[PDB]
Design a binder for this molecule. Structure first.
Ligand SMILES: N=C(N)c1ccc(CNC(=O)CNC(=O)[C@@H](Cc2ccccc2)NS(=O)(=O)Cc2ccccc2)cc1
Ligand SMILES: *[C@@H]1O[C@H](CO)[C@@H](O)[C@H](O)[C@H]1NC(C)=O
Ligand code: NA
Ligand code: NA
Lengths: 250, 9, 28
């Protein structure tokens, strides 16, 4: 996260760290959506252009964390993966269209002050909140700058951007399964997700029922926090039918 | 990164 | 879950975090 700040304790209890076993290192962010299901970006698990293709046994998920590198004894919980599900139409060849994956845990994680699931949006909450100018919140342990790494979880609030502005900011083909967010050069304020934040949540707090909803997944961006560029996020509601199908099935 | 308990490996 | 999106250390205790008001103010 670039130009963000230290998270408060328990601020983002759905935040998950995707952890490589060997060598032990941060792979990506992710989010807790139930006691056994974790949501992330497909490209965190599968990206052939970079020879990335992780299997279940390569990975751990670490839940309830604040510190990036510390083993947070009596606070974090570490879970093994039962199965990875990548969207069958995930487009790694071109533009990361449908950049979404589910991971089922081997055992349910116990909820605590530090561990708690985020809501997934209904059609109405999505229609109400996914509007240009409305701000969401992005969290992660990724790079502090484009070109080091934070001591603790970082947080930044960023406005959703008009789709024509998103489209005009890039040569990449944007799809309805994406949205972009961030400040314009003229707005003064800044901030962005960055490498290592991928798979983490873009959340919004509903003013109707005071619950946090995950609207986006950190997906891609050209550099980090560049003037005139924006962060792109997987549109969670647009892919919710697939999410439900997987959870109903498995 | 601090080593994590062996049980998780 | 039925309890999703409500944080033990914030909503469940009626405490606000330091910047959630920034989000609310953006929601016209
Ligand atoms: N919000 C951001 N700025 C952000 C968030 C997440 C990421 C992680 N995703 C990636 O690296 C995927 N690739 C990119 O974003 C590509 C664009 C692309 C999009 C779709 C398909 C192929 C290429 N941009 S890139 O500039 O190569 C990613 C990058 C950012 C910072 C340092 C080094 C690399 C990157 C940037
Ligand atoms: C990735 O890994 C799986 C399982 O090991 C394999 O079947 C698949 O062919 C690999 N390559 C992909 C999905 O491009
Ligand atoms: Na364009
Ligand atoms: Na920017």
């Amino acid at each position: 996260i670039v130009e963000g700040s230290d998270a408060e304790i328990g601020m983002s209890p759905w935040q998950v760290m995707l952890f490589r076993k060997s060598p032990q290192e941060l792979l990506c962010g992710a989010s807790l959506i139930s006691d056994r299901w974790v949501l992330t970006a497909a490209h965190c698990l599968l990206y052939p252009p970079w020879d990335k293709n992780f299997t279940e046994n390569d990975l751990l998920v670490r839940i309830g964390k604040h510190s990036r590198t510390r083993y947070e004894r009596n606070i974090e919980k570490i879970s093994m993966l039962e199965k990875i599900y990548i969207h069958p139409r995930y487009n790694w060849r071109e533009n990361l269209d449908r950049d979404i994956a589910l991971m089922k845990l081997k055992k349910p994680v116990a909820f605590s002050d530090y561990i708690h699931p985020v809501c997934l949006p209904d059609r109405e909450t999505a229609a109400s909140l996914l509007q240009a100018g409305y701000k969401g919140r992005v969290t992660g342990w990724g790079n502090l700058k484009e070109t080091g790494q934070p001591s603790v979880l970082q947080v930044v609030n960023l406005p959703i951007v008009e789709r024509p502005v998103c489209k005009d900011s890039t040569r990449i083909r944007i799809t309805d399964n994406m949205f972009c967010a961030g400040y314009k050069p003229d707005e003064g304020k800044r901030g962005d997700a960055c490498e290592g934040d991928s798979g983490g949540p873009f959340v919004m707090k509903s003013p109707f029922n005071n619950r946090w909803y995950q609207m986006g997944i950190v997906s891609w961006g050209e550099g980090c926090d560049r003037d005139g560029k924006y962060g792109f996020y997987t549109h969670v509601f647009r892919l919710k039918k697939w999410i439900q199908k997987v959870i109903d099935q498995f | 990164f601090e080593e994590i308990p062996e049980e998780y490996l | 879950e039925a309890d999703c999106g409500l944080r033990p250390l914030f909503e469940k205790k009626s405490l606000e975090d330091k910047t959630e008001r920034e989000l609310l103010e953006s929601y016209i």
